[PDB]
Design an enzyme around this catalytic site. Sequence first.
Site, PDB file in Angstrom:
ATOM      1  N   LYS A 178      42.370  37.811  42.326  1.00  0.00           N
ATOM      2  CA  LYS A 178      41.379  36.797  41.947  1.00  0.00           C
ATOM      3  C   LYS A 178      41.868  35.790  40.898  1.00  0.00           C
ATOM      4  CE  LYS A 178      36.979  36.285  39.550  1.00  0.00           C
ATOM      5  NZ  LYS A 178      36.003  36.975  38.657  1.00  0.00           N
ATOM      6  N   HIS A 185      41.704  34.400  34.711  1.00  0.00           N
ATOM      7  CA  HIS A 185      40.826  33.262  34.450  1.00  0.00           C
ATOM      8  C   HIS A 185      41.322  32.243  33.410  1.00  0.00           C
ATOM      9  CE1 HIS A 185      38.813  36.917  35.661  1.00  0.00           C
ATOM     10  NE2 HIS A 185      37.874  36.193  36.243  1.00  0.00           N
TER      11      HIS A 185
END
Lengths: 233, 230
Positions: free
Chosen positions: B152, B125
């Site tokens: 992700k 992230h």
Amino acid sequence: HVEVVATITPQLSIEETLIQKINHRIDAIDVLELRIDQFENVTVDQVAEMITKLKDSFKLLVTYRTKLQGGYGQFTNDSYLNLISDLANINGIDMIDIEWQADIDIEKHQRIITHLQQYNKEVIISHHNFESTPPLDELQFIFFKMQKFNPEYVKLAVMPHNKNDVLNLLQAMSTFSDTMDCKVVGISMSKLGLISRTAQGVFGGALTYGCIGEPQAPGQIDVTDLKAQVTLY
Amino acid sequence: HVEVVATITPQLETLIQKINHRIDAIDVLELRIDQFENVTVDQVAEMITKLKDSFKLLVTYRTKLQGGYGQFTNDSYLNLISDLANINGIDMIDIEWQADIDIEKHQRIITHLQQYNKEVIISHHNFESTPPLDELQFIFFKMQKFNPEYVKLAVMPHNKNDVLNLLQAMSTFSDTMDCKVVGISMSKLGLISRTAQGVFGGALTYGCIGEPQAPGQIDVTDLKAQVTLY
């Protein structure tokens, strides 16, 4: 701010069922697009009539889509350009659609577009490719040549064969939106390209087309649902 | 198809009701635990049993570094993640990535989790910006090497190109790689990445239970409704 366009394709005798469905969706309609290519031997006078049967909560766009570019219009190219030039005299018309394609007589198109703008009509130059989506550089070049006529809007609809085709269309519209002076409408057709119609505003697009009852393009959406979409992004 | 994720951050029943209400829109229930001081795999197990059979259970410990609250040593964090594999009720585990990590220790932990039949979601992230397309692809490739169930990547866009870049990166990965990919473009500007996640090869899209912790979050019920359109 994306504007929602409602496409109708009535017959000379604009129904009473339709005019009522229109008023019901008054909140979701920014532009009412009156397609007229579904009229054999449609004349400017007939179109003038239909207009009055309508007229002030939305702009009135008149579009004659030729069969060549996905419509019902079989008029001769020559009769087509004559019709487009003649619509300038109809005071109630706010926007007029003029089709672009590689083989057009450029100086003639400019003459017509300039003519329309002198009658204070907003011009929407459009191009439709139902076969494929050219590479990004080619998409940008199409947009480039269309905006050369200095229209109010440039509209490009292409058919995707893969995810990259959708992304390229979005990128071409987005990049155009950032540098050019006129508005842009980018459409990637079929369900694969749905994101371009719903998130049109996210990528700099100016118009998103819907119907009142049934699809007028690759599986159309009711303008009410479309308005909801525009509101979501 | 795209699995809708519902992210929750409890605290050791009003929620139990709001989740059951949206039970039809939930394919995965992400249980974030980094919001708990001194989280033990035991407390985690306690909570899971109190929740848990129509959705997978993803357990996520988001470290402060990557936008979470988790204040654990990298050692106690990586050990916490390894120990979560013992909880039978857990179906998916989120393990963080960052270019400096110990490749072999991470691989050791990922294989471990997969031995206990847990689906691994290796994540990265950036709440500050969105790297160039090439760098996005670079991040994906590194994470992919660990052969996890899902890779992700969440990024903060500054402009439209940043959103398209994330979508492109995710799409291209989708076409070649042999593991599932998840791409998130944050903020309302990136909302389209969540709703049209499956259009570009994405396998998971994240929503909330009602109250957003920032712009770009959507109630899983509305998110499911949008996902259903594409």
